[PDB]
Design a protein around this ligand. Structure first.
Ligand code: HEC
Ligand code: HEC
Ligand code: HEC
Ligand code: HEC
Ligand code: HEC
Ligand code: HEC
Ligand code: HEC
Ligand code: HEC
Ligand code: HEC
Ligand code: HEC
Ligand code: HEC
Ligand code: HEC
Ligand SMILES: [Fe+3]
Ligand SMILES: [Fe+3]
Ligand SMILES: [Fe+3]
Ligand SMILES: [Fe+3]
Ligand SMILES: [Fe+3]
Ligand SMILES: [Fe+3]
Ligand SMILES: [Fe+3]
Ligand SMILES: [Fe+3]
Ligand SMILES: [Zn+2]
Ligand SMILES: [Zn+2]
Ligand SMILES: [Zn+2]
Ligand SMILES: [Zn+2]
Ligand SMILES: [Zn+2]
Ligand SMILES: [Zn+2]
Ligand SMILES: [Zn+2]
Ligand SMILES: [Zn+2]
Ligand SMILES: [Zn+2]
Ligand SMILES: [Zn+2]
Ligand SMILES: [Zn+2]
Ligand SMILES: [Zn+2]
Ligand SMILES: [Zn+2]
Ligand SMILES: [Zn+2]
Ligand SMILES: [Zn+2]
Ligand SMILES: [Zn+2]
Ligand SMILES: [Zn+2]
Ligand SMILES: [Zn+2]
Lengths: 106, 106, 106, 106, 106, 106, 106, 106, 106, 106, 106, 106
């Protein structure tokens, strides 16, 4: 998937999680998010296409994705314990990480 | 597994490695440690529950876990070459990384 | 594989990619590079054997390998879309990351 | 996934297919559509919740989905032969089946 | 399995579902029902042996089995969301399809 | 395989079954027919290329293939019970389903 | 499955074996009995719910189930050699093991 | 794992089960106990190293482990039905089997 | 395999173990012995054919096989730790169990 | 499959290859040819039934099949590199090996 | 297995086939012979240890084993068609290939 | 991989084997050589591109590769028994086969 498609997967699955009422739907959505983020961390955002690959910006992009992966993993961990509301709250807190990256590079 | 259970897995398997006398027992123990550390790096320690997820502390927690993973992988690499004493010595050196994190966040 | 063998795998596969004329050969070569880099990031270079594992040098070594992994993943992503010339150009740009690390630690 | 989510998947993947430039993207998108249609054909749409399961309406609903599945399969058959433009044209033509069902039951 | 044995499987598993108190038991029973229905839909029942394979009676028979499969799938979808009572109600609802076919052909 | 290839596979395997003398050969042949029919039911025959995808012709074509699949499955069921002659007789009778569709659409 | 369900499975499959006419049906039925007995041997029958887990009754119950498993395995071995009538006769003789346990604990 | 390690595993997982608040944790812990007991039943405890392999003592040792395995399996059967509190009570009751063997052979 | 053939397998593999000079050969032989013992324990030997299946003789026969399986497992556990000489000594030790059963029933 | 049926498979798939317009169709046909050749090389053809199995004629027959297998592998290697026209030319070239054997033994 | 072990396996399984009364036993035995021959063809017999690896002797040895493999495969093909007596007769005839090689190199 | 790359693989792995100090490295290297030789035996070397596929030269080329495969398999058989020095000596001896073919066809 291309970077924009991975972002759309992330966005769609937050909506699924928010409206879900059981752990299976939540786990499935978080698993799709994990895969999208694992594909996206190695991408180059359009606004950074002219920057050195080892630039502070590109390193910060990767770091932010690795942090998002950690938070998705932790939300999935709650969902695998069947803690639906807690997993949903963790997914809501994810948005702060999405937004922080977007402010810099989207 | 919860964070404390992953730590207990790490602790138990260092003891197994120290007393082991063959590469199979060592490889098995290191594989369990690898899995425990892969589950733990995305956790939030109790003493950091009120901190921002992107805080210097939380980033340092993750970094320390990624370093521990690298050292476990390298010890496993020795054990897979059947170098039992060298793998045991690498596992002993792991303790410095465990202790360094504990001084800050346990 | 030992560190030097992983480097040889990386070097051999850049040569394969450069001369290739189809996506299958390129994808295969990049997959071998991905595996070599995943094995190598946890190694200790000979020139850093006496340094603390958490030293700035060792952390920089790991970081550089994680960056190389990201660039390999991205080249593979192009090749999986069958974009042979673009994947070859991405592999050529990899060399800057190889060389930057070598200047410091080889 | 619930019926609304499966419909969203179908729509998203039509857009991916239309903008695609390689067979890998197209095949993956059509495979996702196949999965969504296989999940959806046994669902009950809101407007038919009070009808007999063997009503003309529910039978017509199932028949339209089996039609859609066949057309997706045919498009995927083109994409597996790497015929990107032909598979894109088949995907565009699917829309008549989407619209026919929506006119009756959405 | 022969037709009568597949029917006995369907009947046994509806009773298991009704008595169940958790989603695992329900899911396991519905999966057995799926398999029995997949194996039965292509059979010729005793009272239709002297009809043409393309006869309206045989076509009606196959159609009824396909509607049964859809309803079993829909009940399984609820059970996979851990909705035990809803899946149990869906399982009672599919008795309508059992009954309709039996009325004509058992 | 295109529709013509799938029809050739069906015809080849009827001949294999007729001349066979053991259940293994018959089961394999019937399994190949099942796969060919599964790939063919979603095709559009040449003489229906100008009909709507939901035309009465196309829906009759699909219905005939589902009939054929059922009769193949039923023959395979006899072969799986090692009833060679009965499975051969069921395969021979398949010809009336082949012929009926051919009269209309071949 | 609970103990009653496992006993129902055992009884259903004895009847399938008795009426069967080929090795495939017999092998499948015996495989289902093996699974039911494997799930049942660890159960506590109602009439022993008040006995110590290590009581002479409970140990006699487990011993009878291991006997039954052995005799099922031996019947399955005959069926796997395609010896239908011999496997049917072995299944019939199983009844003396069923009955002996029932006299004491059912 | 050696006998001492398998005993440690059994003890650790009893504690995990007692403190657990969801079926996933309980099922995983019971699965680990099943594996440890399957490894241990064929071991020779230090105090019996000079006894015949068919001695009353070694036979009693094996019998006690087969008992334990049955009780673990029964507890896991409850946990697979998501019956957390009931599975916890079954795990607590296992301790009588642990203690009975320890009194004789530890 | 029949009982005599499983016995021949056990005998051949003890000799392979004694002559072996490495753990791979020993492990492979012990795994073959496990399979032969698993297949034999449910048989009725010629000298016991006219005994009841629950007779003391048949119970003794099954018990001896279970003790054999435990001893093969214990030897395999040593071989998996690469302890060739210890596994070879364990393999000689299990001749006691072979002999005891043969004394009574061969 | 019997020898004649494996020959028919080889012949059908050469024609599929010639008519193909993409590498997937070619790869699939060559894989079927590999399997048919692997199954045929050990057969005795009618015109050689009264020759010794080590006769020059039978040795020549096996040799020709091994050369065929190599040429099918080499054509498959081209097709895996997506070189459709080159793989098609390699497929025409292997008719020399078909012809040579047929000259002597068909 | 060393060459002597592989030859013992070949001889054991000829005897199993000769005394067998069903296709399952024959197929298994022939499958074990196939594996033994596959492991043996690359060996160097004692009486050729002093010959060049490419000597006429060693190449004749390899050729005889490829002959044997072909005849084993052909016997297995008959067994897979459930032709027990024909497969037994093919196995008996294998002895002329065994004997021819033994006369030269055993 | 093309023929030149497979030759490079063979040469690289001889060097890995010669410098190795453990069986894991040796086994992996020999496995890679086996794969390279299996790919290469069906290739056509540049100097033989104008020869008949059944020419003495091409037949000799295939025969030399089958020899090489046998010798690699024999070396791997030693390495699987953990006989590092013996496997290294077998790998060194392979070189005579490499050189014999190169003298004729490189
Ligand atoms: C950096 C580390 C990011 C994180 C974490 C997330 N996103 Fe993102 N996002 C990022 C970039 C650089 C871009 C621009 C991509 C481009 O090709 O222009 C985006 C874009 C989006 C979009 C818009 C996609 C589109 O159709 O153009 C969405 C909807 C989006 N991102 C959502 C999203 C969510 C929900 C995230 C957290 C769960 C998230 N992103 C993380 C960079 C980064
Ligand atoms: C940070 C990067 C850490 C690394 C590396 C290791 N540990 Fe740890 N450990 C860490 C925290 C934050 C905590 C507190 C957890 C809590 O829930 O309070 C711990 C705790 C432990 C414990 C005690 C567990 C308990 O029962 O309370 C142990 C025994 C332990 N840790 C062991 C351990 C070992 C052996 C490690 C290296 C191999 C190791 N830890 C690494 C943080 C971090
Ligand atoms: C650090 C982050 C590195 C990256 C990225 C790459 N290489 Fe490397 N390389 C590194 C070290 C520390 C060493 C020394 C290893 C030793 O044991 O001495 C090397 C060595 C090489 C070699 C020489 C190997 C030898 O036979 O001695 C080669 C050919 C090589 N490296 C190639 C290579 C390529 C092609 C890379 C990018 C694709 C690359 N390396 C990355 C450190 C690092
Ligand atoms: C009947 C056989 C249908 C076919 C074929 C397709 N769709 Fe559909 N769609 C159908 C219904 C009954 C509904 C309403 C569901 C509800 O809960 O109200 C829908 C809805 C949609 C939507 C809206 C989803 C949402 O966000 O609420 C979309 C975007 C949609 N459908 C798309 C779609 C496409 C692209 C299809 C063909 C490829 C398609 N649908 C087929 C019934 C049927
Ligand atoms: C037609 C499409 C049917 C559907 C749907 C179901 N059943 Fe059925 N059933 C059908 C026939 C033609 C027959 C007669 C079979 C015969 O060989 O005589 C049956 C029979 C049964 C039986 C009796 C079987 C026996 O033990 O002899 C049972 C218990 C039964 N059917 C149950 C059943 C259930 C529970 C169904 C829905 C879940 C169901 N059937 C569907 C035809 C059809
Ligand atoms: C409709 C539901 C069909 C069924 C059932 C069967 N066949 Fe068919 N067949 C069908 C069509 C529309 C066509 C024309 C295909 C075309 O591209 O023109 C065919 C054709 C054949 C052929 C000729 C193939 C060729 O290369 O020209 C054969 C040999 C054939 N069909 C055989 C066949 C058999 C044996 C069937 C039953 C087992 C069978 N067909 C079923 C439509 C349908
Ligand atoms: C002890 C070792 C048993 C063996 C061997 C078999 N059965 Fe059994 N059976 C056993 C008990 C303790 C019970 C009572 C279960 C309860 O919950 O009360 C049963 C019961 C049955 C039943 C009745 C099931 C019901 O729904 O009431 C049947 C039909 C039955 N058992 C059949 C059966 C067969 C066919 C067996 C041999 C093949 C067999 N059982 C063995 C204990 C034991
Ligand atoms: C016999 C059938 C046993 C059963 C059932 C259980 N245990 Fe055990 N245990 C047994 C022996 C012979 C020994 C001594 C082993 C030795 O090497 O000395 C033990 C020991 C333990 C220990 C101590 C382990 C250690 O750290 O040295 C523990 C913690 C223990 N056993 C726990 C345990 C539990 C929780 C059990 C039931 C779930 C259990 N054991 C069963 C023999 C037997
Ligand atoms: C009872 C529990 C036994 C155990 C344990 C072992 N054997 Fe056995 N063996 C047993 C019987 C009843 C028989 C007679 C079988 C018959 O059909 O007559 C045998 C026979 C053998 C043989 C001879 C087989 C033959 O070629 O005819 C051998 C070589 C043999 N047994 C070896 C053997 C070994 C090595 C064992 C332990 C590893 C072993 N047996 C265990 C009963 C039992
Ligand atoms: C010897 C090594 C052969 C090679 C290589 C190929 N074929 Fe063959 N073929 C061979 C024989 C001995 C026979 C006669 C078989 C018999 O039972 O009479 C055949 C036959 C055929 C046939 C006719 C089969 C039929 O329908 O009766 C065909 C169509 C055929 N062969 C095709 C074929 C192709 C295309 C080959 C290369 C790709 C090929 N054969 C190789 C012997 C040998
Ligand atoms: C050459 C191509 C052979 C074929 C074909 C078969 N065998 Fe063989 N066998 C061969 C050699 C070189 C040797 C000597 C091995 C040694 O280490 O000295 C053997 C030996 C045997 C033996 C004796 C084994 C022992 O322990 O001494 C047996 C029982 C034997 N061979 C049986 C056998 C059978 C049954 C074959 C055909 C099915 C067969 N061999 C083929 C070389 C070759
Ligand atoms: C024939 C049966 C061969 C055997 C056995 C081996 N090699 Fe080879 N090799 C062969 C040819 C025809 C060629 C030339 C290919 C070409 O495209 O020109 C080669 C070439 C090599 C090379 C050079 C590769 C390069 O970088 O261009 C090497 C390094 C090589 N061969 C090594 C090698 C080794 C180590 C072998 C045995 C283990 C070996 N070859 C066997 C033909 C044959
Ligand atoms: Fe960092
Ligand atoms: Fe219809
Ligand atoms: Fe669950
Ligand atoms: Fe069979
Ligand atoms: Fe007992
Ligand atoms: Fe090993
Ligand atoms: Fe030859
Ligand atoms: Fe492709
Ligand atoms: Zn992607
Ligand atoms: Zn979307
Ligand atoms: Zn966890
Ligand atoms: Zn512990
Ligand atoms: Zn490595
Ligand atoms: Zn190289
Ligand atoms: Zn769904
Ligand atoms: Zn069936
Ligand atoms: Zn029943
Ligand atoms: Zn197709
Ligand atoms: Zn159960
Ligand atoms: Zn163990
Ligand atoms: Zn057996
Ligand atoms: Zn033997
Ligand atoms: Zn065949
Ligand atoms: Zn054909
Ligand atoms: Zn071997
Ligand atoms: Zn290749």
């Amino acid at each position: 998937a291309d970077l924009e498609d991975n972002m759309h997967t992330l966005n769609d699955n937050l909506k699924v999680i928010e409206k879900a009422d059981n752990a299976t739907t939540v786990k499935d959505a978080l698993t799709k998010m994990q895969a999208a983020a694992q594909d996206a961390w190695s991408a180059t955002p359009p606004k950074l296409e002219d920057k050195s690959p080892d630039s502070p910006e590109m390193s910060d992009f990767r770091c932010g994705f690795w942090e998002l992966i950690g938070q998705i993993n932790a939300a999935l961990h709650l969902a695998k314990q069947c803690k639906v509301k807690e997993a949903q709250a963790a997914a809501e807190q994810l948005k702060t990480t999405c937004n922080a990256c977007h402010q810099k590079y989207r």
